[PDB]
RNA sequence: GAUGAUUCAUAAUAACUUUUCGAAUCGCAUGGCCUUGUGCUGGCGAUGGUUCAUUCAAAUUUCUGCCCUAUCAACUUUCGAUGGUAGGAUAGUGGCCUACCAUGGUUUCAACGGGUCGGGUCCGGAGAGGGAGCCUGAGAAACGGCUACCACAUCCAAGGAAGGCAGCAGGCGCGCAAAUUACCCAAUCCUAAUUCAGGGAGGUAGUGACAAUAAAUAACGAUACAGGGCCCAUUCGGGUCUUGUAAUUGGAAUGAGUACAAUGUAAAUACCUUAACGAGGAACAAUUGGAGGGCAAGUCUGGUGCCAG
RNA sequence: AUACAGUGAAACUGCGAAUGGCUCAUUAAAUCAGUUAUCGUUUAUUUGAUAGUUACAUGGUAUAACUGUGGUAA
């Protein structure tokens, strides 16, 4: 018989009573009949914790299979404590793919069982799950991964490195660990590894300020109905206040109010709009709107405003009646509550699009703003009463500035509400605090007021600066403070960012991460930052040694993309780069730092300028300047971003050419994806201006089928674009041809051009030019006209919208504010100057 | 069976009483005194290639 | 040729067949010849195969066969009844079923209806989620299998998966009570590519005042000390003589038991036999029922002391 | 034992599993007891009889067991 060290039972006591949850790392083969006897220490501990257990495991589970009907065969061709514990408890099996089915339900576990496998929104996506007093174990068996723990304890500095990935993520991890301290690391026979940052932990004595504040609010309200019964269901008091701050609206009665409720998951944003929702039915509120992605989502504010139904009194099918979806695709889902309670209320479901159906409304309620396009929910903005919910970090989500970005587009009187306690633990648990650490998901960007002593630096003189990977995630003070800086700016600019970007950034080698750091005179601040990956012909030897692995890792979008759409074999074998993302500071945004960024790095490949890593079994600089490292060979510049005027604007003024785009909008944005190039100085340039054309071609006959809803202006832009790539062809070889005779009597019969000719002189009436028109705009755009035939900017976009992206001349008044008889007069007075161009000709 | 001992585990008290190249690292790793963070502190880091080592952040 | 009796047996002719069958098999031995080639010719079995008969059976089928009955006189014909013809099917006969035709069939000698497991441990008869349809086999409408269905119910990662014995024992049915979920195929039989494998067929053992048979729990002396003991009789009384011990004491006999064993048995228990130990309170301490006494500084109750209950 | 020769897991073939055991709800010539026929039938097996009408040996038109790669909670 051992005892097991004091530490163990001390702290898991500890969590129990404070309800707080932690973290044991098992190292050891036999670490799995540890399992077992860490939860009976907590059955003792507490008998009102959750029993159910949550497993993940990659592909293979550790020597046992969860049927039990083969356990009893195996057993067939006295037991040890493990195969009890599979027994008896309540284990729930989970492959790593599939954390989604997990993001609901809860558990007193969760157990990883293979650390090399662990990804951030795995780990993000499991443990958020367990409850107060909680505990969370990873299983690190691997052999190597002993290795690794064993060189990062006698040396802080010294990485371990087997024989691309780097792997970053899984040691700054083990540092991060020995930092929490409610995580202790451990073997199979019990001992405590000092690793942990779980050193000195004693024993709390016997045994929440919230619940009293809580508690003490709940009788105070108790004799204002509605407020005493809506108030009694909240679990928080951050949760009360939400729900009192939404009545003090309902209240008001004001019809230019917006409310902006934000939280992360699990803090019970649906329960508080659910309520209110209850609440604006007593309160007399008659046409109540709700909107959301998709209405399976609103089944939970759905419930918890029936629930908050029950608290007022209203009873199902005498007061109120549900009303369900017949669409398969919603799975009867509920579309509408109708409420005969003292007038006719109705609460009912629409999708974001229809905002026409909202002049009648006196409430809507955004659910996940997040995850409806900006265009959709700035229509949405009606005169009326606002309720807004967006989750941050929550789901797929968006970036935080976008979440602020509204705001300072509400900058309409706005009310903003947050909600920061979660209703399912103890506040301020360890493990969330740890992990806001290592995966940096809640930082912020913070106004230095040294750049305003000082003034913003002027773009020239700000210096672009190399960064090395393998000294920022070190995890040394330093260096982290300049990570969540970047992570600061990086979360900010883009629409959205997932949790496993900051893996991605770490641990492959083709991404190669800039920042654009003010002139040197404290920890430098960056002002932009800047991470490309290489793509071409350079990333080939690594995709073959994944394909000697037999684990194809990643994929070449743009070697792939523009092989399908043009099926050149040069680009595949061209190397190249591309910029995923530039991030500036929105609130220096417009002073240039971007461009001088990528002028910088456009300099720096082209060679104008012109070992760090750790030892593998005393850190190297911070940052590398570009001088000191030697660019990679390459050939071209490339981007990703969805066609935004902004981007586009920003993209065409910094030299690149547009090559594709995809007639698909993405739903999450609902835009559509783009792919622009620049070819470097000194290398071949002809096979941009051929695709540069097609894609032309391409997009003037799509510009109807998926582009319509693309402004007149926006579609002159990115032609303007297109044709400034064979400006950039001084070469004379490839040429627009200038229409024969022959072609104009094919394409257009004699009697065409004589009405044509009835126009110009003003004999003829406009639909009967209908056909025409189109021809013309293929004809024009197509630069066959030739310098003969020119246009304004406006003409242009009306000849092209009526010709190619096909509305009627009225709609067009409304785009370009001008009234709808002068475009008819502009539209002529066009009409005329081919007219005459044809009779030259003739 | 609070009492009795189930599986190889029993408490008396407050004390829980049970039944029970990498060992080398583990004892090794056992005997380690100082933690990561207070090594850490002695460490400066160089930011620039020339320049000064930052030791803690203000 | 055969039978009491044949369109029976058997033979022949002409064709027919999605039509057969008439050893492309195995073990053991290696003889007799010669024309020395491993040339010819070969012994005993096994497993196969057509038809007939025999055996194992099955299926229909003839006549006879103890209840009260008319306060049960009509019963079938009301989806074949009685019969004939032809067809289908069956292993075949056959209203067994189909197409046409005839109007019949039982019955006051009791039809029809009503009331009240069989015969002699043996021979028979019947049944094992509900119902419907199929499956192989010589033998089944199989306690086996399959399809769809009606219910019950088990698991899941919720995507699916699968599930049906009073035979043997052991249980529930009360809140009040009863033999073991034992051992073996050693016997007698039964199935198989078979001596040898198996069989909860069976056998062996375990429990018990349901019943039935036999008998232990003592047998034999010596001494001492006293004079009453017993029978009949309502009555008074009468009649008879070796008795009593609530006394002491002696040496023998052996069973339950405990057991060296052997025997017994598939093995084992038990039975029988048999070394050693094994009795005076032979405390090695069977019961059940019935008829009477008598005793207190004791207690209760009615009275005509000292009584009566 | 230079085809193997021994026994022999597994698998393919052959045979059997309609025997035996158990309970009595039903039905008054219904089975049943005796009795008769099958020239009106089927019958594994047993037993006895019974077939003169490329070949010094054909094919996979063949795969199990077996080797090896996998999926599934199963």
Known sequence: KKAIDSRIPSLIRNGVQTKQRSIFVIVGDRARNQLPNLHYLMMSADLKMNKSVLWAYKKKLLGFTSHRKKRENKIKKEMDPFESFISNQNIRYVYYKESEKILGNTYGMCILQDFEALTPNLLARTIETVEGGGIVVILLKSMSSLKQLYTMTMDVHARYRTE??????????????????????????????????????????????????????????????????????????????????????????????????????????????????????????????????????????????????????????????????????????????????????????????????????????????????????????????????????????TGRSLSLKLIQQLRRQLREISLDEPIRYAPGDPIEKWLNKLLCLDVTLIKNPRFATRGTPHPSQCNLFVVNRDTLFSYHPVSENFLEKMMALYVSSHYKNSPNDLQLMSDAPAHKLFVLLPPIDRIPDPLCVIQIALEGEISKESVRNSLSRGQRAGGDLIPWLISQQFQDEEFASLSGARIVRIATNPEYASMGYGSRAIELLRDYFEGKFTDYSIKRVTLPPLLLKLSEQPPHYLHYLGVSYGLTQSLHKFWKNNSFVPVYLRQTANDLTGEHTCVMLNVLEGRESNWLVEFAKDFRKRFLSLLSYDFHKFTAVQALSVIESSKKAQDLSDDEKHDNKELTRTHLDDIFSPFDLKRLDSYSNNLLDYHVIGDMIPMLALLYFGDKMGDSVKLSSVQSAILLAIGLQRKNIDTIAKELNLPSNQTIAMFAKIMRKMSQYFRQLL | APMSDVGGVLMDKDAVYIDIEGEKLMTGLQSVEQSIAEKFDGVGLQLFSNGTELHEVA
């Not at chain 1, 045994?207 to 009788?219: A, G, I, S, V």
């Not at chain 1, 944003?269 to 039915?281: D, M, P, Q, T």
């Not at chain 1, 005969?340 to 999708?351: A, E, G, L």
């Open chain 1, 164 to 397: 691309d990935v780097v792997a970053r993520f899984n040691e700054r991890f083990i540092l991060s660990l020995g930092s929490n301290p409610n995580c202790l690391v451990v073997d199979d026979e019990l001992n405590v590894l000092p690793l942990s940052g779980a050193k000195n932990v004693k024993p709390l004595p016997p045994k929440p300020p919230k619940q009293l504040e809580l508690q003490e609010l709940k009788e105070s309200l108790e004799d204002v109905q509605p407020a005493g019964s809506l108030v009694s269901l909240s679990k928080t008091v951050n949760q009360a206040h939400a729900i009192l701050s939404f009545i003090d609206a309902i209240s008001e009665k004001t019809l230019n109010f917006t409310v902006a409720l934000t939280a992360g998951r699990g803090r019970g944003k649906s329960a508080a709009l659910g309520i209110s929702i209850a609440a604006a039915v007593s309160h007399g509120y008659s046409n109540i709107f709700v909107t959301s992605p998709s209405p399976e989502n609103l089944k939970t504010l759905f419930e918890f405003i029936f629930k908050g139904f029950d608290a007022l009194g209203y009873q199902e099918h005498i007061d109120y009646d549900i009303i369900q979806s017949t669409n398969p695709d919603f799975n009867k889902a509920i579309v509408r509550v109708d409420i005969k309670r003292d007038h006719r209320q109705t609460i009912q479901y629409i999708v974001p699009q229809d905002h026409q159906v909202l002049g009648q409304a006196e409430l809507v309620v955004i659910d996940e703003a997040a995850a409806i396009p900006l265009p959709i929910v700035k229509n949405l903005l009606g005169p009326y009463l606002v309720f807004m919910a967006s989750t941050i970090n929550g789901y797929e989500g």
